Write a protein that binds this ligand. Structure first.
Ligand SMILES: [Mg+2]
Ligand SMILES: [Zn+2]
Ligand SMILES: [Zn+2]
Lengths: 113, 436, 47, 49, 147, 49, 66, 84, 140, 133, 97, 263
RNA sequence: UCGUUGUUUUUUUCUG
């Protein structure tokens, strides 16, 4: 009766952006990212990567409430780099890693069969 | 009905004024009311199918009264016993007890997350307990993050020194945990606990925020540490059952000697109590003592990692007697305060012989639940449980009637401006409410 | 509007290609119950 | 069933009795005011005609 | 089958459900706290025996007052290649990490009950009133009013 | 009907734990929210809303 | 009532395996063997083939309305 | 006769919680139905928030009339009551 | 057959093994009552099977002798509401309220009594894979 | 900046109920009557009985929020195998020569005994502790 | 010495017995013999003994208010229809009870 | 840097070794495979006539769960966003079934095989219900007696398992690392000892046991995962692997595009 | 053409 639709979990409505960014005033060079229609599948992956970089001071996130499919990510890199640059760097690095993995697996399967 | 609106909230029956407070609405999907697990305690409510009512105001003044007099934070301390009424319960409690164990450490990234889980976080990561060779945090630091600043608390447990080798006792300095396991006796609803202090110091709002903060942190940590119970938790080594069996046999032989000597009129008469009554009292004392001993031995046997021991020591659920019955021995059955009567002609069940008084012959369940029960013992246990059910069923109605009579007696007493206490007519009952 | 209580389908949106019957037609926004689940949904008159 | 009425609570009729061994279920009974006054035949019960 | 009644708190999807090493995501999770204070040991015994039965391929016998001891069940289960007490090494689904402790895990017979939520939900803003007293009528089916 | 009486603007339903709610909050199913109502007076501060 | 399509727990298809399971049963092979030969290792599936009660054949025994 | 002169007012000078709630409700009701606002407002739209903001400044034109048990009464201006 | 009254004057062995005096020492099973107060015994009847003292509903429970009695009572009063296949001919009948469960499954941990109650032929529950563990604090 | 230093001989090490943590009974060698009771992480830095530990206490490491240690910067800690950041919660100015300082390392406790001369400078709020070997 | 049965006026007068500390658990006797206030204190003691037995604890002011209401009018005003309705409160208040 | 080593392969399943990648990466891969790998399944059933002993919703549900060959579904547009009024042949596939038992005796058994593709954006290799083998009749849909007839006209669409479990292509994804617990991510509940009570993982051979005198290493991190994959047959295991990787990649690309476009 | 109304009385088995 009051059940939420299953198609609302991933199909982002137009009025709200997929990603929303805000600054964190309490400390410098810190921003808060409000994601949408996402869950641990992406947040955890991004966090693990961003934590490995040396120039990133604080990276964190939390799935506020499971009944709502979105999460917020707090990121603060040292003054050297603006957080957004680190974020896009992490995205690119992960994409490259995945492409390499796909190539290797394709080779392995081909020789296997 | 939009967000942030104040709406009354009740559970029937409404025994005491804490049984109904005013909450703040937060519309969510699906078709169930949702509550913070802490606030059940006053409602005496469980999620096993209980229902609660919701009454909406219909004006602006009414909203004012609901917001200012019946807001949940303003009901944290109960005038009944001047102690906090809500507290940390169930998973949060059994989780915080482990999280503050001296030997828990948290890697950097996990801490990075947790500090983000606290809404009221100041945004300053504390320095790790260990800086080399690997940064580490001790859970107590994280918990201290939840506790607001400038809070002082301390407690002495069992004549502990200030080195707290056993880690009992408590100490918090400026909202930081110096030492000690956090558990029921500290965060629980009991008076003199952390909640009482925070309430009396910073006010209601900070106390509510403390509840939320601690629940969030401990829930996250437990989620990412995991906790559970298993059948083995109710099992003990062989030597322990040997000890228990020896204790049971010794108790039974003591009872046998008591029977032999009272049969020969060699057993002393207690004051005001005849031969039969004194003999029964002696037997009951003996059997209770034997069960206590067996349970205590089983208790010492359990290793510190045993799930049941953890969840009892934390105090979230159960107690010692639960462990004793589960593992060592169910113990003697009480019905109407006496051993099982002789419903049959001079016996309890046909399967026995006429004129027997041995503990098994009058409802002494020897085997622990884990070992199962014989038919006679099972039936006797059933008798006891049936009596208990009847007892609750009868007691509830009479207590409700007494409650109604009392309320309809004292429903008009009102503390007047002069400091006197007068009923409707103006007759004075006390010249100063409580003389203070 | 004499065009009520007649089966109507949907062409664009999240419920594309589903049958239904008009229930209320106040104006510019039709509330047509869905036959597959036990629910009702609104949708403008253009879809 | 027992038509003992519910005027005056008492406890004797409700409490399980030794003689019930193997004639009526020990575990099965309703809850609330009828607790005990409604009993269910044991699995091997038989009634004299 | 042991009076461990309870309502569904929330439902997680396959991926988020913690998964054992073999990918068996539990159907249904209950709180350990419920067990000791109620001493429903039969619940755990049945879970163990059901796990044994499913692995060995036959239904177990739980007739009360018999010789089937827990230890025999543990021996059988270990022989079949599992932890002697039915525990398992279980992985968090949010981050694929192990859990510091193990988890009891197995099949158990659960039965749904008639008290569905939609049969109890109810609200009244205004509506029919008793003719005699001009007060809201009684009963959910007639848009009753709370007393 | 004098001390106690059935009132309006109420609701009854099942409850459920939710750790992610602040202490004084409460979850209201959307249907109830849509059904119950709270009168509000019109002013300059709220006319647009 | 009828054999389920997929194993609620995991999702591995099992519905089509009912006939083969019966067939293996008639020829005297014990249930464990039958389940093995069907390649049902995760007991999350085994519980179903092992503990399904078939009722549709009971329903058919009623002369249809039409 | 029933009134008590300002000099001998004996009741507690503080503001009891019940007085607090009644005053807040009354003020919010008044404001929320086209009444003058005695203090500036920055961004707060709720009448009740406006009410507490007004109270915190001690700018409320309400006089509490306290009835003693006998029937005699004394009156206090909201401007002169010590609010915690 | 023996009525209630005649039970007053008989000696009933719980099981046939009691008819034969015994001479072991297990920590995971039961120990009989001592029963040494009668040097000799004159048994006249032997319980056909102790598990027969339970009612209909109670027979459903597995290992009902390993539970605190009130839990047995609750489950007894509860199983009379478990949805299931109440009658094969549900289709033809016209009742006011009738529920059926898509895929009933006979319980894995059976009892020797459900043979005669047909429960294994008309079950009312599904063997669900259950994990006992504090996952996210939503299940308290 | 080292507010103190000495070399201690491990009298005994107690695991207690814990596994990762053990309590060590330490006494100085250069001057007796100085006893150190400390809590240490077994696995992170195992120790054995009658070992030698170079204990060093400093109120700072230079030569507010935390940060991962950049390899570029250098700190006093670079020459020790076990570092812990502590807090003082009781500075017992006891009898003529028994002065006890109590430091809690976010749960890990430490008691230090000896003469006033050595300990006089320790009346501080936060104490780092460094251990060689 | 703790005894059964009640005869306060007599036992209190027996030689060799402290007549200033003798106590009885039937407070109506206290009203008959030791005036009203003694009855009030004894009643408070009885209520406290009952409540605290299980280990519970209730703030003193509540029991004080209860006992004072019971013995406001100088005689034991039992908590039932008889005593309460025998009061001189409004007719409406008493009819509702 | 990332490495793969397939151990045992097959059409429906794969048992591979994946190392030198963040645990987060492998776990996210598992989740994405289980959740966000679009496939094709029934999504609208119109019963033109039924006489079976099974409720219409029952048969609709059973149909919803049957696996379909969704090899080329990647090329089918989402019906939600497809411009065509109603459903074109390029945003949906139509399957029809109508089996009838005749004769006073016997009992027909409507099998999944009886479903027959009618339309579909050909020649795309999609829609046909999956079959184990050549003769495999497939799933059992219902049983029919005398004078009982069934006529349904199904519809399929491309959807992700998130929306409903019927779109899940993966059955069960095993997963594990450090079979010897050398990282000590877990403490082993035990009565006597951790070793002699706990069965060892089936990969215990693939890694050397920790030496008795060895000291704990704290800078070690999980490095080898031993994950198996299975499918319903609606997609080849290798195709599922590649497709999950592609989905993750394109989702990250979308995130990056949004980030850069924020300005 | 806004408007627009739906029983009592008992008994019963249940839920917290
Ligand atoms: Mg309840
Ligand atoms: Zn399965
Ligand atoms: Zn199209």
């Amino acid at each position: 009766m009051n059940a939420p639709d299953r198609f609302e979990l991933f199909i982002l409505p137009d009025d709200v952006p997929k990603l929303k960014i805000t600054p964190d005033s309490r400390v410098p060079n810190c921003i808060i990212i409000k994601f949408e229609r996402e869950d641990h599948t992406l947040a955890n992956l991004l966090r693990e990567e961003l934590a490995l970089y040396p120039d990133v001071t604080f990276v964190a996130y939390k799935v506020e409430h499971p009944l709502f499919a979105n999460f917020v990510m707090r990121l603060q890199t040292e003054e050297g780099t603006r957080p957004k640059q680190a974020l896009e760097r992490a995205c690119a690095s992960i994409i490259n890693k995945l492409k390499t993995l796909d190539h290797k697996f394709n080779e392995e399967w081909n020789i296997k069969n | 009905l939009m967000d942030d609106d104040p709406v009354l909230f009740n559970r029937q029956p409404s025994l005491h004024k804490m049984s109904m407070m005013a909450h703040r609405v937060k519309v969510m999907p699906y078709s169930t009311f949702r509550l913070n697990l802490s606030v059940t305690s006053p409602y005496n409510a469980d999620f096993d199918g209980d229902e609660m009512n919701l009454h909406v105001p219909q004006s602006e003044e009414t909203r004012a009264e609901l917001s200012q007099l019946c807001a949940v934070p303003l009901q944290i301390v109960s005038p009944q016993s001047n102690k906090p009424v809500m507290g940390i319960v169930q998973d949060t409690l059994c989780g915080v007890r482990k999280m503050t164990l001296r030997d828990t450490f948290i890697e950097y990234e996990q801490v990075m997350n947790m500090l983000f889980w606290v809404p009221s976080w100041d945004g300053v990561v504390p320095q790790p307990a260990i800086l080399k060779p690997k940064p580490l945090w001790t859970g107590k630091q994280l918990l201290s993050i939840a506790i607001p600043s400038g809070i002082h608390l301390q407690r002495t447990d069992g004549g502990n020194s200030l080195l707290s080798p056993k880690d009992n006792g408590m100490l918090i300095v400026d909202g930081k945990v110096m030492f000690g396991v956090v558990d029921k006796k500290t965060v629980g609803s009991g008076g003199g606990g952390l909640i009482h202090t925070v309430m009396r110091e910073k006010g209601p709002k900070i106390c509510a925020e403390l509840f939320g903060n601690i629940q969030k942190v401990v829930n996250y940590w437990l989620l990412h540490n995991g906790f559970s119970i298993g059948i083995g938790d109710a099992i003990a080594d062989a030597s322990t059952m040997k000890e228990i069996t020896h204790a049971i046999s010794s108790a039974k032989e003591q009872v046998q000697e008591i029977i032999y000597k009272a049969q020969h009129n060699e057993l002393e008469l207690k004051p005001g109590m005849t031969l039969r009554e004194s003999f029964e009292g002696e037997v009951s004392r003996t059997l209770n003592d034997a069960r206590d001993s067996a349970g205590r031995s089983a208790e010492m046997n359990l290793k510190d990692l045993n799930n049941v021991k953890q969840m009892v020591s934390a105090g979230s659920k159960g107690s010692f007697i639960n462990i004793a019955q589960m593992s060592a021995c169910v113990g003697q059955q009480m019905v109407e305060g006496k051993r099982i009567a002789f419903g049959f002609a001079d016996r309890s069940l046909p399967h026995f012989t006429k004129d027997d008084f041995s503990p098994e012959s009058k409802g002494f369940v020897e085997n622990s639940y884990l070992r199962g029960l014989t038919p006679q013992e099972f039936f006797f246990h059933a008798m006891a449980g049936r009596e208990g059910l009847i007892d609750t069923a009868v007691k509830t109605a009479e207590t409700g009637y007494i409650q109604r009579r009392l309320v309809k007696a004292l429903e008009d007493i009102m503390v007047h401006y002069d400091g006197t206490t007068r009923n409707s007519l103006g007759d004075i009952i006390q010249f100063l409410y409580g003389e203070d | 509007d004499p065009t009520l209580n007649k089966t109507v389908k949907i062409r664009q949106g999240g419920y594309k290609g589903k049958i239904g019957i008009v229930k209320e037609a106040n104006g510019d926004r039709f509330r047509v119950e869905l036959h597959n689940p036990n629910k009702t949904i609104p949708i403008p008159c253009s879809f | 069933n027992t038509p003992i009425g519910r005027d005056g609570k008492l406890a004797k009729p409700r409490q399980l009795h030794n003689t019930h061994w193997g004639l009526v279920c020990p575990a099965e009974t309703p809850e609330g005011q009828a607790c005990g006054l409604v009993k269910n035949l044991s699995l091997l019960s038989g009634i004299s005609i | 089958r042991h009076g461990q009644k309870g309502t569904i708190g929330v439902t997680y999807r396959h991926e988020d459900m913690p998964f054992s090493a073999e990918g068996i995501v539990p159907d249904l999770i209950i709180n350990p706290h419920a067990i000791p204070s109620r001493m429903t040991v039969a619940h755990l015994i049945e879970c163990l025996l059901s796990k044994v039965g499913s692995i060995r391929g036959y239904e177990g016998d739980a007739t009360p007052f018999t010789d089937l001891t827990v230890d025999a069940v543990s021996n059988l289960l270990r022989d079949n290649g599992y932890q002697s007490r039915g525990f398992e090494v279980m992985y968090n689904g949010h981050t694929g990490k192990k859990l510091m402790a193990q988890v009891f895990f197995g099949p158990t017979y659960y039965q749904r009950l008639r008290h569905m939520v939609d049969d109890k939900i109810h609200a009244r803003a205004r509506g029919p009133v008793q003719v005699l007293t001009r007060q809201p009528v009684e009963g959910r089916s007639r848009d009753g009013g709370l007393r | 009907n004098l001390m106690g009486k059935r009132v309006d603007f109420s609701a009854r339903t099942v409850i459920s734990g939710d750790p992610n709610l602040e202490l004084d909050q409460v979850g209201v199913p959307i249907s109830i929210a849509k059904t119950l109502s709270y009168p509000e007076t019109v002013t300059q501060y709220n006319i647009h809303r | 009532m009828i054999i389920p399509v997929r194993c609620f727990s995991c999702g591995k298809v099992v519905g089509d395996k009912w006939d083969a399971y019966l067939r293996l049963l008639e020829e005297g092979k014990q249930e464990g063997d039958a389940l093995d030969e069907l390649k049902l290792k995760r007991y999350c599936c085994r519980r179903m083939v092992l503990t399904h009660v078939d009722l549709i054949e009971k329903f058919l025994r009623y002369n249809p309305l039409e | 006769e029933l009134a008590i002169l300002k000099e001998e007012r004996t009741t507690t000078p503080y503001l009891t919680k019940y007085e607090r709630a009644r005053i807040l409700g009354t003020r919010a009701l008044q404001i929320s139905m086209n009444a003058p606002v005695l203090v500036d407002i920055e961004g707060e739209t709720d009448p009740l928030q406006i009410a507490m903001k007004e109270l915190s400044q001690r700018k409320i034109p309400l006089v509490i009339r306290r009835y003693l048990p006998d029937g005699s009464y004394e009156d206090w201006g909201c401007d002169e009551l010590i609010v915690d | 057959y023996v009525d209630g009254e005649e039970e007053e004057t008989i000696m009933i062995a719980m099981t046939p093994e009691d008819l034969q005096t015994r001479s072991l020492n297990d920590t995971a099973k039961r120990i009989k009552p001592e029963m040494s107060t009668s040097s000799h015994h004159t048994f006249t009847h032997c319980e056909i099977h102790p598990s027969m003292i339970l009612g209909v509903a109670a027979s459903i429970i597995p290992f009902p002798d390993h539970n605190q009695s009130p839990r047995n009572t609750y489950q007894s009063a509860m199983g009379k509401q478990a949805m299931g296949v109440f009658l094969t001919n549900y289709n033809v009948r016209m009742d006011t309220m009738a529920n059926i469960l898509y895929y009933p499954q006979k319980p894995l941990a059976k009892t020797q009594a459900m043979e005669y109650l047909k429960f294994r032929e008309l079950p009312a529950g599904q063997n669900a894979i259950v994990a006992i563990a504090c996952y996210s604090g939503y299940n308290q | 900046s080292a507010l103190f230093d000495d070399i201690f001989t491990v009298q005994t090490v107690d695991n207690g109920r814990y596994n990762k943590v053990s309590r060590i009974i330490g006494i100085s060698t250069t001057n007796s009557a100085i006893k150190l009771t400390l809590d240490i992480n077994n696995e992170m830095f195992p120790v054995s009985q009658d070992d030698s530990l170079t204990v060093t206490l400093a109120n700072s490491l230079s030569l507010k929020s935390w940060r991962p240690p950049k390899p570029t910067d250098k700190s006093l800690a670079d020459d020790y195998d076990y570092v812990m950041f502590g807090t003082v919660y009781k500075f017992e100015e006891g009898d003529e020569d028994k002065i006890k300082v109590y430091v809690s390392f976010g749960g890990l406790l430490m008691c230090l005994e000896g003469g006033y001369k050595s300990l006089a400078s320790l009346k501080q709020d936060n104490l780092y502790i460094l251990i060689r070997r | 010495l703790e005894t059964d049965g009640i005869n306060l006026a007599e036992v209190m007068a027996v030689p060799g017995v402290d007549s200033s500390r003798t106590y009885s658990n039937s407070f109506v006797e206290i009203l008959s013999v030791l005036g009203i206030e003694a009855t009030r204190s004894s009643l408070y003691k009885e209520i406290l003994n009952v409540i605290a037995f299980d280990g519970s604890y209730v703030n003193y002011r509540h029991m004080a208010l209860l006992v004072d209401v019971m013995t406001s009018r100088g005689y034991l005003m039992a908590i039932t229809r008889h005593g309460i309705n025998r009061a001189d409160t409004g007719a409406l208040m008493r009819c509702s009870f | 840097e990332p490495k793969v080593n397939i151990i045992n392969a097959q059409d429906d399943e794969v048992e591979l070794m994946l190392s030198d990648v963040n645990l987060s990466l492998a776990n996210s891969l598992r989740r994405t495979m289980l959740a966000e790998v679009p496939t094709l399944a029934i999504d609208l059933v119109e019963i033109k006539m039924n006489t079976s002993v099974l409720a219409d919703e029952f048969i609709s549900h059973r149909l919803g769960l049957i696996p379909l060959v969704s090899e080329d579904v990647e090329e089918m547009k989402y019906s939600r966003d497809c411009t065509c009024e109603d459903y074109c042949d390029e945003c949906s596939v139509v399957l029809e079934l109508s089996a009838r038992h005749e004769g006073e005796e016997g009992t027909t058994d409507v099998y999944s095989s009886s479903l027959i593709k009618v339309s579909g954006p050909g020649n795309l290799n999609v829609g046909e219900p999956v079959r184990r083998d050549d003769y495999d009749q497939g799933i059992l849909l219902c049983k029919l007696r005398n004078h009982q007839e069934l006529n349904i006209r199904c519809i399929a669409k491309k959807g992700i398992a998130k929306e409903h479990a019927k779109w899940s292509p993966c059955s069960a994804i095993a997963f594990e690392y450090d079979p010897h617990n050398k990282l000590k991510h877990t403490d082993f509940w035990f009565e006597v000892d951790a070793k002699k009570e706990w069965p060892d993982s089936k990969y215990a051979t693939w890694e050397e046991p920790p030496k008795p005198g060895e000291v704990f290493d704290y800078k070690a991190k999980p490095n080898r995962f031993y994950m198996t994959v299975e499918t319903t047959g609606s997609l080849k295991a290798n195709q599922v692997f590649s497709r999950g990787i592609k989905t993750l990649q394109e989702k990250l690309a979308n995130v990056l595009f949004e980030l850069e476009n924020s300005r």
